[PDB]
Amino acid sequence: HMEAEVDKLELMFQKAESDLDYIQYRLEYEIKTNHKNPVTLLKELSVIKSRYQTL
Amino acid sequence: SSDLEQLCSHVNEKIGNIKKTLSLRNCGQEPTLKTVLNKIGDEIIVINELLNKLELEIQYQEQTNNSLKELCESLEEDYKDIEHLK
């Protein structure tokens, strides 16, 4: 009974997961297919914002 | 950490991880972001050359203040010389 209801809830969550999983899978695909980045840009900006005050 | 909470964190991680891989796609594909990203990246190269210039101008500036001191020194010797004598 409620066990059945819960079986549903679990089923839904599992869907939501594979939903999310797909969205991700796609983004990764669009990403792979094309060819800077903010990551190294921060490191560079700290190297400058530092040796400016040093200098 | 409850089974409930642990689930949530599983969710937020999947959610968050998308949003990051999302911004990674946006910033590396969509043009308006991609320019402002190169505009920063270019302006890093210049603000880097502006450092090298500030580097030499410092090791120059010093070397004059060095001479502009070493002059001032010798110039209080030849005065204390003329202060004692006349």
From Swiss-Prot, chain A:
Compartment list: Cytoplasm, Cytoskeleton, Spindle; Chromosome, Centromere, Kinetochore
Residues of the full protein shown: 1 to 60 of 121
UniProt keywords, alphabetically: Cell cycle, Cell division, Centromere, Chromosome, Cytoplasm, Cytoskeleton, Kinetochore, Microtubule, Mitosis, Phosphoprotein
Protein's recorded name: Spindle and kinetochore-associated protein 2
Primary role: Component of the SKA1 complex, a microtubule-binding subcomplex of the outer kinetochore that is essential for proper chromosome segregation. Required for timely anaphase onset during mitosis, when chromosomes undergo bipolar attachment on spindle microtubules leading to silencing of the spindle checkpoint. The SKA1 complex is a direct component of the kinetochore-microtubule interface and directly associates with microtubules as oligomeric assemblies. The complex facilitates the processive movement of microspheres along a microtubule in a depolymerization-coupled manner.
Molecular function GO labels: microtubule binding
Presence of keyword Transmembrane helix: no
Subunit structure: Component of the SKA1 complex, composed of SKA1, SKA2 and SKA3. Forms a heterodimer with SKA1; the heterodimer interacting with SKA3. The core SKA1 complex is composed of 2 SKA1-SKA2 heterodimers, each heterodimer interacting with a molecule of the SKA3 homodimer. The core SKA1 complex associates with microtubules and forms oligomeric assemblies. Interacts directly with SKA1. Binds directly to microtubules; but with a much lower affinity than SKA1. May interact with NR3C1; the relevance of such interaction remains unclear in vivo.
One term under GO cellular component: SKA complex
GO terms for biological process, alphabetical: attachment of mitotic spindle microtubules to kinetochore; cell division; chromosome segregation; establishment of meiotic spindle orientation; mitotic cell cycle; mitotic metaphase chromosome alignment; mitotic sister chromatid segregation; regulation of microtubule polymerization or depolymerization
Gene: SKA2
Record-stated family: Belongs to the SKA2 family.
UniProtKB/Swiss-Prot annotation, chain B:
Compartment(s): Cytoplasm, Cytoskeleton, Spindle; Chromosome, Centromere, Kinetochore; Cytoplasm, Cytoskeleton, Microtubule organizing center, Centrosome
Coiled coil start-end: 47-86
Domain of life the protein comes from: Eukaryota
Similarity comment: family membership: Belongs to the SKA1 family.
Assembly and oligomerization: Component of the SKA complex, composed of SKA1, SKA2 and SKA3. The SKA complex is a homodimer organized around a central W-shaped coiled-coil structure, formed by the interacting domains of SKA1, SKA2, and SKA3, each end of the 'W' is extended further by the C-terminal microtubule-binding domains of SKA1 and SKA3; the complex forms extended structures on microtubules. Interacts (via SXLP motif) with MAPRE1 (via C-terminus); the interaction is direct and stabilizes the kinetochore-microtubule attachment of the SKA1 complex.
Function: Component of the SKA complex, a microtubule plus end-binding complex of the outer kinetochore that stabilizes spindle microtubule-kinetochore attachments, promotes alignment of chromosomes at the mitotic spindle equator (chromosome congression) and assists suppression of the spindle assembly checkpoint. Kinetochores, consisting of a centromere-associated inner segment and a microtubule-contacting outer segment, play a crucial role in chromosome segregation by mediating the physical connection between centromeric DNA and spindle microtubules.
Protein name as it appears in the record: SKA complex subunit 1
Biological source species: Homo sapiens (Human)
Whole sequence portion shown: 3 to 88 of 255
